[PDB]
Each structure stands twice: as C-alpha cells, then as structure tokens.
Structure 1
Amino acid sequence: GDRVADVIESSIGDSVSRALTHALPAPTGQNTQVSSHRLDTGKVPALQAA
C-alpha cells in the first residue's frame, strides 16, 4: 500500500541505546543470607561455562 511497509516498520534511525542492564544502588557491601544443605538433581550453581 502507501507508503511501502518495509519503511513503516523499519527500525532505521532508532535513537536510544537499548540497555541490557540497569544500575542498582550499592552503598554497603552485599549482605549474606543464611544457607542450608541441598542435595538435588538439576539445580547446579557451581557448574558453569567460561
């Protein structure tokens, strides 16, 4: 139609830099919550891929 669609939708000229992360306040060092034992399958924090 009028005008062409690939111009209407087109994101050309998008001004604002899309933020993947926002800043949080850290006046103090992070506090530590209490923890207990955990013997489960699937939940595995230690294993990671560098």
Structure 2
Amino acid sequence: GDRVADVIESSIGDSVSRALTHALPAPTGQNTQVSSHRLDTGKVPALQAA
C-alpha cells in the first residue's frame, strides 16, 4: 500500500514525452502581409539576444 505522501505526489512512472512544440501544415510558403510605418518605443523586433 502506497500510504506515504512522497510516493503519491511522485513523478516516477511517466511514459509521456512533454513536447513544447507541435507540428503544423505548410503546403506553401508564407503569404507576406501588408505593413506601414511605426514610430513607437518598447516595440523593437530588431534587437535580439543570440
């Protein structure tokens, strides 16, 4: 009998693969959408950290 608590809450016996991602379809390349000019702060896609 599993009467202790550290055995009930245990993560042992996990046959599942936690996947962050998930596949999607792509029969064609992506359709470029329209854009216009923006002059805002905070928003800044160019600056990355590699």
Name the CA shift for 1:12/1:2 in 2 (closer, same or farther; >3 Å). closer
**TM-score, normalising length: structure 1:** 0.91
Higher relative contact order (CA 8 A, sep 6+): 2
Name the CA shift for 1:2/1:15 in 2 (closer, same or farther; >3 Å). closer
Structure 1 outlier segments of 4+, above 3 Å: none
Matched length: 50
Kindly state the Cα deviation for residue 16 of structure 1 after the two structures are TM-superposed: 0.8
Kindly state the Cα deviation for residue 49 of structure 1 after the two structures are TM-superposed: 0.3
**TM-score, normalising length: structure 2:** 0.91
Q: 22-31 or 2-11: which moved more?
A: 2-11
Q: Which sections of structure 2, spanning at least 5 residues, go unmatched?
A: none
Name the CA shift for 1:11/1:48 in 2 (closer, same or farther; >3 Å). same
CA distance in structure 1 between the partners assigned to 2:26 and 2:2 by the alignment: 52
Higher helix share: 1
Q: Which sections of structure 1, spanning at least 5 residues, go unmatched?
A: none
